[PDB]
Amino acid sequence: EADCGLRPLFEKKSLEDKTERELLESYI
Amino acid sequence: IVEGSDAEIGMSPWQVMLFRKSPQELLCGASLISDRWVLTAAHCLLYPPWDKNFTENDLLVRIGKHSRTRYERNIEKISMLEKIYIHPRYNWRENLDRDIALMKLKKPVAFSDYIHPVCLPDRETAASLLQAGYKGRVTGWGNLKETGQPSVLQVVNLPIVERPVCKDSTRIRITDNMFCAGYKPDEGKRGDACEGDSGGPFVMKSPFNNRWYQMGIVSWGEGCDRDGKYGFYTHVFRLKKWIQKVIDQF
Amino acid sequence: GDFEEIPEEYLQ
Numbered sequence: 001e002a003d004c005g006l007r008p009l010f011e012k013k014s015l016e017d018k019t020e021r022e023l024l025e026s027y028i
Numbered sequence: 029i030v031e032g033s034d035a036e037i038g039m040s041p042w043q044v045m046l047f048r049k050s051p052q053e054l055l056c057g058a059s060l061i062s063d064r065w066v067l068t069a070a071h072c073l074l075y076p077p078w079d080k081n082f083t084e085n086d087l088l089v090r091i092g093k094h095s096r097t098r099y100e101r102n103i104e105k106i107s108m109l110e111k112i113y114i115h116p117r118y119n120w121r122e123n124l125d126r127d128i129a130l131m132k133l134k135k136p137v138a139f140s141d142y143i144h145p146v147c148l149p150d151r152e153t154a155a156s157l158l159q160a161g162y163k164g165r166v167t168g169w170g171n172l173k174e175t176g177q178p179s180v181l182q183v184v185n186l187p188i189v190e191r192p193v194c195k196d197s198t199r200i201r202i203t204d205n206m207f208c209a210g211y212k213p214d215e216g217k218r219g220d221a222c223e224g225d226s227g228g229p230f231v232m233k234s235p236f237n238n239r240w241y242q243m244g245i246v247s248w249g250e251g252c253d254r255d256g257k258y259g260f261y262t263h264v265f266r267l268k269k270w271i272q273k274v275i276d277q278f
Numbered sequence: 279g280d281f282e283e284i285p286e287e288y289l290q
């Protein structure tokens with residue numbers, strides 16, 4: 001899918017979900 | 029999900045529910061990879077030991093849900109299954125090696141704010157993301173404790189665990205097609221999948237292109253959130269060739 | 279508890 005993995009209510013809106021930071025911070 | 033938290037609305041547009049026709053009940057979790065293809069664990073569809081063996085006609089696929097029990101009108105979409113494809117080499121007699129299966133919807137579903145597909149990883153993303161200590165996220169409406177049901181979809185983020193540790197925590201021969209994940213007794217944080225969660229997606233967000241990829245499938249675990257034990261997931265990239273094959277050929 | 283009734287369209 002062309003726009004796969006992109007959430008209409010978050011990424012597409014440039015908004016972050018409550019805990020996704022946790023994930024990104026684990027990726028050294 | 030044990031020791032998790034309520035998902036935000038729209039947090040997992042790809043999350044899918046495997047619903048049994050009669051008796052109307054929650055069977056497993058699944059994910060939407062395309063407008064006509066749902067990905068789930070095979071053990072959800074077939075497992076002789078527990079007399080399980082469902083067909084296309086036995087169940088329904090419910091997309092866009094948030095609440096476990098309420099039929100979310102105007103929001104969720106329920107579809108029928110055209111064909112079910114289990115891995116030709118699904119080792120259910122031993123370790124559930126290649127615990128994967130595809131489902132073809134009867135008619136495509138339409139995406140919305142609550143319904144959107146997740147990406148399947150490419151070798152690089154997999155190479156770069158599947159590393160111990162790197163956290164992923166699991167979701168589901170399964171049991172809140174090993175031994176009750178949440179009202180809405182749960183979420184928990186677990187770190188991937190070193191291959192040696194995973195092997196040393198179980199009596200089960202783990203293959204390259206599996207990878208475990210969870211916290212260690214000492215880390216002072218808990219969380220794990222549980223009954224009714226299996227089949228579900230373990231995703232990660234790429235720090236390179238901002239997309240969400242499903243790295244695994246909730247396969248099997250011994251108990252729920254037990255110290256020194258971890259959940260095992262089907263290594264999705266490792267079996268991508270079968271996924272593409274089926275999709276393309278059929 | 280238990281689930282809620284879903285449209286009959288879907289049960290055939």
Ligand SMILES: O=C(c1ccc(OCCN2CCCC2)nc1)c1c(-c2ccc(OCCN3CCCC3)cc2)sc2ccccc12
Binds near residue numbers: 071223246
């Ligand atoms: O997803 C499985 C899961 C799937 C398969 C499995 O088989 C274990 C055998 N070996 C084969 C390969 C590895 C271990 N064990 C656990 C999971 C649990 C579960 C527990 C009991 C159950 O029903 C028993 C209750 N029953 C009485 C009658 C019928 C059902 C259904 C689901 S608990 C759990 C926590 C984390 C990740 C997955 C699972």
Ligand SMILES: *[C@@H]1O[C@H](CO)[C@@H](O)[C@H](O)[C@H]1NC(C)=O
Binds near residue numbers: 076081
């Ligand atoms: C399971 O279901 C299929 C479809 O009815 C059938 O062909 C098969 O014999 C059943 N048992 C097993 C273990 O495959």
Ligand code: NA
Binds near residue numbers: 195196198199200
């Ligand atoms: Na071992």
Ligand code: NA
Binds near residue numbers: 210255258
């Ligand atoms: Na654990």
